[PDB]
Amino acid sequence: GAKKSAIGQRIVATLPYIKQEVPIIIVFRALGFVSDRDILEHIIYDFEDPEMMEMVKPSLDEAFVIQEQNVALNFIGSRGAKPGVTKEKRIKYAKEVLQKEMLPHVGVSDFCETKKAYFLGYMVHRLLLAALGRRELDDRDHYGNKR
Amino acid sequence: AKQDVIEVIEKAHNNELEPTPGNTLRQTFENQVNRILNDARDKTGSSAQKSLSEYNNFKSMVVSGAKGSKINISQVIAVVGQQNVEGKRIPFGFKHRTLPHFIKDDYGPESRGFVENSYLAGLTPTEFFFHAMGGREGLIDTAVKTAETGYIQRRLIKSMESVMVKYDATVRNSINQVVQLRYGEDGLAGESVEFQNLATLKPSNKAFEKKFRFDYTNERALRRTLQEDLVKDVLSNAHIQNELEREFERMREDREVLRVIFPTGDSKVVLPCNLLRMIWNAQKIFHINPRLPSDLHPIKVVEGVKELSKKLVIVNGDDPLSRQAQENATLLFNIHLRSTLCSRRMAEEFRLS
Amino acid sequence: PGIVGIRFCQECNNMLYPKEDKENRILLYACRNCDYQQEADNSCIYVNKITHEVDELTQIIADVSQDPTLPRTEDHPCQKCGHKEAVFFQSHSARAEDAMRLYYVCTAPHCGHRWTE
Amino acid sequence: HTTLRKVTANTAIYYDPNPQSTVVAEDQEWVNVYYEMPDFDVARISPWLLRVELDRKHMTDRKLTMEQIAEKINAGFGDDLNCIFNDDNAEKLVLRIRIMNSDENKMDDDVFLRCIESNMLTDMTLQGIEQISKVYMHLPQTDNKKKIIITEDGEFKALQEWILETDGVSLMRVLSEKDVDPVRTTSNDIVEIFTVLGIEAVRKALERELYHVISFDGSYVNYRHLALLCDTMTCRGHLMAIT
Amino acid sequence: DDEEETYRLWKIRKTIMQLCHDRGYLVTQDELDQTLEEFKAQFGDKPSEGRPRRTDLTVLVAHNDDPTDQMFVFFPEEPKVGIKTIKVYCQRMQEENITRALIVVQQGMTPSAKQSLVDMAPKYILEQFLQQELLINITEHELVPEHVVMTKEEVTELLARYKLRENQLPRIQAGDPVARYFGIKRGQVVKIIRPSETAGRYITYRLVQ
Amino acid sequence: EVAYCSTYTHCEIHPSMILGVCASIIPFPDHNQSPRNTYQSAMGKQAMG
Amino acid sequence: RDGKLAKPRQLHNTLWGMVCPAETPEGHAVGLVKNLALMAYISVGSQPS
Ligand SMILES: [Zn+2]
Ligand SMILES: [Zn+2]
C-alpha cells in the first residue's frame, strides 16, 4: 500500500482486557512520559546507535496525533471491555488497567508507573534486537524456559 | 576422517572456503563435512564386511536376506556414524553449543553428533545422548505417520468404492458413467501379468536386421539349422520367400511404434503370459535337441501366429469401431509376441519341433 | 556516507523532522509541536544499507573474555600489548549473511582489544 | 526474478539545492558531464535526491547494464522520475534519482520520495518472472531427465544437457520464452498444469507424480491401479479433489 | 525492444496458422513454415514506427470443405478491448458475410465485452485468445495427447456400439485450453488417442459440457 | 597435551545418573540401539514381581 | 495429544541430566510425557527478601 510502504515497521502492544491493539508510544504517554526524548530514553539505552533509532522512528509517527497523557488514556479506554458512557469513566478505567492488569509483577501500586516504564521499555528494546538480528529468537522448547 | 574435518573447519575460519553455486557458505560447509563423514562410515563399514569369516552368523542372516541389512553389521563391528535430527546434523540446544561439556562454536565431528563407537565397544556418555536424540525422531514419525496414512486410506476408498468392471468389461462407477472403456486400458486382471523384455526395442538398426531377418541366401546355414526337406522347399518357392519379407516388414513397423511409445528405451514391460518361459518349457517337455536340425516349417511359424492373434479377443465385435479398438488393446502384446516367435528365432535360438 | 541518526528539539524534547526551506534552499529540522527550527549540518537524511556489510568489531563486548565456555588459543598474540591468550568466537549474530569468520578478543585484564583475521 | 533490491548495495536520500553542489565528493565529475548539455531539465530540477549504490558483483553476475536499469526505471514510473548513472569506469557504481522535473512545472517530497524507494526495492522487477524464487542449474545423471536421441544407427544415445529447475512456478510464461523447450518443460504442480495444458495433461501429469512418490522408495505398484485413480479424479471434466 | 515485439508477432502468427490448419481450414504449406527473416521480410521487422501496426496482420482462411465458410483472426491494437471496439469488428463481419472469427487480445477483455461475445450465439461467434495463450502450441507438448473432434455420424455409431447415453461419457469442459484450441462447442465429442504402456494405445472419448 | 578446554568449572558426579528410574535397570544400556532402551522403559513397568 | 506437530515431542539438548532420554511412553503420547533423571531435584521455592 501507499502508507504501509512509507512507514516501515510499526510496533504495537496487545494488552490484557483491551479489545484490539494499541500503538506503543501511546502506552508510554499513558504512563506519564510526555516527551519523545524520555520515551526513547527508556527503550534505547544508547543514542549513538542509529540502527535502533531508525527502527523506532515509524512508531513515533503513528502516535504523533496524541500528544497528551489524558488524551492517551482516553484513546485506550475507548477499546476497553465496554466503552465508558462518560469520558472520565474511561480515563478512570484505563488508568486502572495500567495499574493492575499491566505487568503486575513489577508493582501494583501508584508510583510504579516509573517501575513499569523501564521494563515495558525493555520488552520493546528486546523486540528490536530480534528485529535487527543482534540476538537469537527464544526457543519454545528450551527447557530452561519451563516451570 | 576426523583429521580431514579439522582442515575443512580450519579453512572456513580463515574464509578460504568458497561457496558452491546455489549454496550458502553454511550450506557448502554442512555439505563438505557430510561428504567426508559419510565416506568414513562407508569405508569402515566395507572394511568390516571384508573381515567377516564364512562361518559368521551375521553374514548368514544378511546374505540370505532373512533378516538384517548390510548396514547393521557396519554399526555393530565398525562405526555407528553420524546421528541426524530433522535431516540435519545435531543442532545447538544451548547457546552455540550442543551440550554443557563442549565449547561454544565447536563444529567438529564429535560435538555435532558423530558417534565413532560401535554398539559392541559401547557408546560414550554424550554419544549415548545424541544417539537417543536420533532415535526419538524414529519413534515420533512412527506415531504420527500412521494416523495420516489411515485418514488417506479411508478417503481413497470412499471415493472409488463402487467402481466395478461391468459385463461389457467397461469399467463404470455406481451411476453407469464410464471411467474406462477397458479395465486398465488392456482389459487384464493384474494378478496374472509378469515382467518381460520387448527385445525388438533397443538393439541397433544393424543388429536388428541381423537377428530377426531370416536370411535364406546361405543355403548352407539353412542345411545346418533346418531339415533337408524344408530348405529345398524354402529356396524353391518364391511365394514363401515373399511371405517372410512381409513378416519382417511388420517387425520394422512395430519397431517404429515401440520407439514412439517407449522413449528412453526402457524395454521392461508387463504383459499377460511369459513367452520366454513357455518357449523354454516346450523345449524340456518334448526333449528337443538344439544341436540337431529342426523339423519345424518356417511358414507354419508365420501362419500360426497370425491365426493365434485372431483367437486372443479382448473386444468382441465386427464393427470397424470394434476392430480398431482391439488392435489397440492387443497392440503391445502382438508386438511382443511377434518378436519372440519370429520365424528366425524359431530356426536358430529355440529350434522348436 | 554515514548511518545518520536522530535529532531532538531543545524545548519540548520531541523528534525534529527534516524540511526544506524554499526561499534559501537550506535543509531545516523543525519540531511539529513548536516553532523551533535548526539548520541541517549533515545534509543527509534517510540512509539505508541493503547490502549491509556490517562491522562486528563494533558490537563485540570486551567483557566476553571472561566466559569459560569460549575457546582460546595462544597461537594469535594480541596486536596491542602482545598478550598470547586470545578468546575467539564466531558471529553469534542472526542475519549475518554467511560468515564463519572468527573474531578475536584479547584476554588479560582491561586490554579488551578486538581484532579479526 | 531480480528485484532492484537484489543488486542494490546501499541507499541514501540527499538534499541538493542545485545539482552542481554535489554534497557527495565523487559525483561532481560526471554530474557536470551530463549537465554540460543538460536535457529534459527545462521545467526545473527537484531538490530531493535519491542516490543508490549497485554492487558490481551482483551487477556482473546477472549481466546487467546500467543503461538497462535506467530504461526500466524510467519506463516503469514514466516521466515522473529522472535517472542518471555512471559509466562502468567508476569503481563505486552509482545511480542518481530525482523527482519529476515537470512536477515542479500533497505527499510532500522526502516522504513521497521515500515511498518511491520502498516501492522500487520490492516491485521493480528488473529481470525474470515474478513468483520464481530461484533457479538451479545442473547436468542430470538420471536417465529420465537425460535427453535420449535415436542415432543414425537406431541406437539410443543418452545425451547430457543442462537443465534448469525452478523454485516456484508460473508455467505459462516460462514456456513462452525463447530457447526454452516447449515440448518437454513440465511442472509438478497440478492446478497450473490444469489451467494451462488442459485436463488431459492432468490425467498424465498426475500419474507421473503419483508414480514418483510411490516408486521413489524403490517400491513398485502396478500401473493399472495408478491409472484408475487418475481416471476417477479427472473423469468429471475438472480436477476432483478427494475430500 | 522492437526485435522482441517482432519475434512475438512471429510466434502468434505461426501458432495461429496451426490452429486454422488443425481445425481444417485451408492453409498453404508456405504459410505454415515461415523463417523469421522471411516473416521479417513480409511484415517488416519493427512494429513500432514500422510497417506492421498490429493491423493488416488479419488472417482470412477458408474451410476445406466449404469455400464460403472461412473465418478471421483479428489482432486489436489496444492493450484492452471494449464493446465499442468489438462492435467495430462485428460490423466488419456483417460487411463481409462471414460468421466465425478470432480475437487475439494483448492484455485482457473488458468485463462488459466478454458477455457481448456471448450476446451473439447464432449469428456470429468470437473467441478470446490472450496474447500469451498463442505464444506456444500446447498441442505439441508431451503431456497433451492427440485430440480429434468427431463428426455427428461417428458419435451416433459410437454410442450405439457401447450402448451409452451421451451423459455417461467423461467430460471435458468448454473452458479447457484444448477445447478452445479446436473450437469445440457444447455437445460435440472428442477422441483422445494416447499411447499407453500397457495396451500400447488407447482411445478415450470426452464429451464437451 | 592438546587442550580442549582449560576452564572446566564443574565436574559431573557420574554420567549414568542421566537415566531415570525405569531405564536404570538395564544392564549395558549404551550397547543397544536407542529405541531399545525406550521399549524396556515401557515393559519394565509391567513386570510381575 | 492429538497434534501431529513434532517439535514438542523431540528430545532437546536441555534435557541432559534433568530428564531421562530413553524413558517415555509410546502411542499418541510419545515424548509428551517424561520421567525424571535420578539426581534431578525440582526446587521448592523461596522469598527473594
Ligand atoms: Zn520542539
Ligand atoms: Zn592485549
PDB file of N, CA and C and ligand atoms in Angstrom, chain C residues 78-83 85 106-108 111-113 115, ligand 2:
ATOM      1  N   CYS C  78      48.145 -10.897  21.043  1.00  0.00           N
ATOM      2  CA  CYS C  78      47.453  -9.621  20.972  1.00  0.00           C
ATOM      3  C   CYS C  78      48.232  -8.644  20.111  1.00  0.00           C
ATOM      4  N   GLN C  79      47.497  -7.855  19.330  1.00  0.00           N
ATOM      5  CA  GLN C  79      48.135  -6.879  18.459  1.00  0.00           C
ATOM      6  C   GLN C  79      48.653  -5.682  19.251  1.00  0.00           C
ATOM      7  N   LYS C  80      47.902  -5.241  20.264  1.00  0.00           N
ATOM      8  CA  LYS C  80      48.344  -4.079  21.030  1.00  0.00           C
ATOM      9  C   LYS C  80      49.454  -4.440  22.005  1.00  0.00           C
ATOM     10  N   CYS C  81      49.123  -5.152  23.078  1.00  0.00           N
ATOM     11  CA  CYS C  81      50.072  -5.373  24.157  1.00  0.00           C
ATOM     12  C   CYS C  81      50.893  -6.638  23.974  1.00  0.00           C
ATOM     13  N   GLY C  82      50.640  -7.414  22.927  1.00  0.00           N
ATOM     14  CA  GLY C  82      51.383  -8.638  22.723  1.00  0.00           C
ATOM     15  C   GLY C  82      51.118  -9.680  23.786  1.00  0.00           C
ATOM     16  N   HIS C  83      49.846  -9.952  24.046  1.00  0.00           N
ATOM     17  CA  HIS C  83      49.437 -10.971  25.000  1.00  0.00           C
ATOM     18  C   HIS C  83      49.050 -12.224  24.234  1.00  0.00           C
ATOM     19  N   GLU C  85      47.162 -15.016  25.075  1.00  0.00           N
ATOM     20  CA  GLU C  85      45.820 -15.578  25.123  1.00  0.00           C
ATOM     21  C   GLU C  85      44.852 -14.735  24.312  1.00  0.00           C
ATOM     22  N   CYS C 106      41.088 -10.130  23.191  1.00  0.00           N
ATOM     23  CA  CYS C 106      42.291 -10.354  23.974  1.00  0.00           C
ATOM     24  C   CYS C 106      41.946 -10.571  25.436  1.00  0.00           C
ATOM     25  N   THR C 107      42.531 -11.599  26.030  1.00  0.00           N
ATOM     26  CA  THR C 107      42.344 -11.863  27.447  1.00  0.00           C
ATOM     27  C   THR C 107      43.330 -10.962  28.189  1.00  0.00           C
ATOM     28  N   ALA C 108      43.563 -11.241  29.466  1.00  0.00           N
ATOM     29  CA  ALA C 108      44.309 -10.428  30.414  1.00  0.00           C
ATOM     30  C   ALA C 108      43.473  -9.201  30.738  1.00  0.00           C
ATOM     31  N   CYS C 111      42.723  -5.101  28.741  1.00  0.00           N
ATOM     32  CA  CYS C 111      43.154  -4.886  27.363  1.00  0.00           C
ATOM     33  C   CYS C 111      41.960  -4.815  26.421  1.00  0.00           C
ATOM     34  N   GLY C 112      41.172  -5.885  26.360  1.00  0.00           N
ATOM     35  CA  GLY C 112      39.943  -5.904  25.595  1.00  0.00           C
ATOM     36  C   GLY C 112      40.058  -5.662  24.105  1.00  0.00           C
ATOM     37  N   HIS C 113      41.265  -5.703  23.547  1.00  0.00           N
ATOM     38  CA  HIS C 113      41.422  -5.432  22.126  1.00  0.00           C
ATOM     39  C   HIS C 113      40.775  -6.526  21.294  1.00  0.00           C
ATOM     40  N   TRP C 115      40.119  -7.983  17.385  1.00  0.00           N
ATOM     41  CA  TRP C 115      40.602  -7.978  16.014  1.00  0.00           C
ATOM     42  C   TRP C 115      40.003  -9.152  15.264  1.00  0.00           C
TER      43      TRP C 115
HETATM   44 ZN    ZN H   2      46.134  -7.391  24.642  1.00  0.00          ZN
END
